[PDB]
Amino acid sequence: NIIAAKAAEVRANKVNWQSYLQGQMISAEDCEFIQRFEMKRCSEEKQEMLQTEGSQCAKTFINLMTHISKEQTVQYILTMVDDMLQENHQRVSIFFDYAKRSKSTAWPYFLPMLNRQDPFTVHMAARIIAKLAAWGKELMEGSDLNYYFNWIKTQLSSQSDSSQYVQCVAGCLQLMLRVNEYRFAWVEADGVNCIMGVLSNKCGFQLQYQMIFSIWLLAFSPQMCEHLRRYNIIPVLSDILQESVKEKVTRIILAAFRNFLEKSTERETRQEYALAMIQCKVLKQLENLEQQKYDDEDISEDIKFLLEKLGESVQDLSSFDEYSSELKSGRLEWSPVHKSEKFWRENAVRLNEKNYELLKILTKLLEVSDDPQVLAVAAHDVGEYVRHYPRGKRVIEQLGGKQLVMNHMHHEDQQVRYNALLAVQKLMVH
Amino acid sequence: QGIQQLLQAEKRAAEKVSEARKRKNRRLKQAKEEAQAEIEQYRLQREKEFKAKE
Amino acid sequence: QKQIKHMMAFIEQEANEKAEEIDAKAEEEFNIEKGRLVQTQRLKIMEYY
């Protein structure tokens, strides 16, 4: 959005280079080159200019960004190279050749322009840096890579103008995430929090695509898929997968979800991505999207892939373990698996599993939850636990969990007081 | 003006995505050819090492 | 004027996004096919000499 809308003005912002030359702000070599480049009419005539004066071109662009004070002239120069690299991505090699002739890496000639005083200048500088860093044979490293990511993370932290500038930031970040080691450096900058934050802020479909494309690119490595779990990213993709049927957004979620699951060479991590999607009930939405009209195989075949793999973890979740997940996630409710006798009648003893984890959860929720439904549900859970597993009475008595129930007899909610009394009945009365 | 220039941009858009469905397919063929140039140089190097040892 | 050029840049971006996705999804397959053949032959030739 914003960068294209401003470029439609800045392409018309032609310049009196003879004034800057007379002012000694540029060399005659810079002035002559940019004049010849302005006279060459089309991408092929610019290719003739690069074929005859390619090192002088890279020199001139760097000079006219560096030595000019005025931001909008630097934006025009940035727009001219941004378009020149849009016409052919291979042209980045000419700037690396010039940097090597200059006995340098490329990055010191461009990274200073991230400090530019007009937002369009710094975003266009970031596009040039992202294009060089994505398409070059030479790659960013260390302090340069981390500094440009700190600029990106700063612009992602700017949250409609901020969000609409951040579309360019996302495109630049996707261009960076084309390169493998830059993914690790972005995870070391911890910047996936900001991508997740934009998706949590319920952004428009352009940002949904561009941010989930950034996540899809992050998910290319098995070692990244093992680590990316801590950002809680599957829920925000699953929300957008329900809220946004847009063809691109649908496809890039399916791509991100396929990359997370399929690149997980660790079986626990593979199972965990398949199961997190099933805790988000993604498989039902993938069936809704299978029934929806889409013309793209990169939608259709990745739907069917995920339906097969989540077709494993749906069997894991649709156990009595839908209760296990409601405890693990803290989603205590009057759910069918809490309410149904069959669960307790067949499984009540399992509250002792994983060193009493489910008992410890229910005890902690009865100790510190604010929700009378959770408290009453947990008291009901204790009532049926004691009803269906007699030794469970001794275990609650040894854990002291009874004290919470006996206190909640005077809870402010009649639903809690009733379930607390009912649990005291099922605990103390035969 | 507007819709005609927008349809021209749409035609260029359609051509650009159609070329993306071709770019990496040409590289994927050339992978089978680069995996011969790499191999003869390595075969020559391994033979030179062996012949130096002989 | 600006709105026309914005829509032109948008409909070409509506291809640039797909084109980057197609380039990125296929990027691995070229790298795998080269790496597969190179490792396969360099292992055989290593062991032969």
From TrEMBL, chain A:
Residues 317-430 form the ATPase V1 complex subunit H C-terminal domain. The keyword Transport applies. One of its GO terms (molecular function) is proton-transporting ATPase activity, rotational mechanism. GO terms for cellular component: vacuolar proton-transporting V-type ATPase, V1 domain. Keywords: Hydrogen ion transport, Ion transport, Transport. It holds the Pfam family V-ATPase_H_C. V-ATPase is a heteromultimeric enzyme made up of two complexes: the ATP-hydrolytic V1 complex and the proton translocation V0 complex. Subunit of the V1 complex of vacuolar(H+)-ATPase (V-ATPase), a multisubunit enzyme composed of a peripheral complex (V1) that hydrolyzes ATP and a membrane integral complex (V0) that translocates protons. V-ATPase is responsible for acidifying and maintaining the pH of intracellular compartments. Belongs to the V-ATPase H subunit family. This is V-type proton ATPase subunit H. It comes from Rattus norvegicus. The lineage of its organism: Eukaryota, Metazoa, Chordata, Craniata, Vertebrata. The gene is Atp6v1h.
TrEMBL record, chain B:
Residues 3-52 form a coiled coil. V-ATPase is a heteromultimeric enzyme made up of two complexes: the ATP-hydrolytic V1 complex and the proton translocation V0 complex. The V1 complex consists of three catalytic AB heterodimers that form a heterohexamer, three peripheral stalks each consisting of EG heterodimers, one central rotor including subunits D and F, and the regulatory subunits C and H. The proton translocation complex V0 consists of the proton transport subunit a, a ring of proteolipid subunits c9c'', rotary subunit d, subunits e and f, and the accessory subunits ATP6AP1/Ac45 and ATP6AP2/PRR. Belongs to the V-ATPase G subunit family. Subunit of the V1 complex of vacuolar(H+)-ATPase (V-ATPase), a multisubunit enzyme composed of a peripheral complex (V1) that hydrolyzes ATP and a membrane integral complex (V0) that translocates protons. V-ATPase is responsible for acidifying and maintaining the pH of intracellular compartments and in some cell types, is targeted to the plasma membrane, where it is responsible for acidifying the extracellular environment. This is V-type proton ATPase subunit G. The gene is Atp6v1g1.
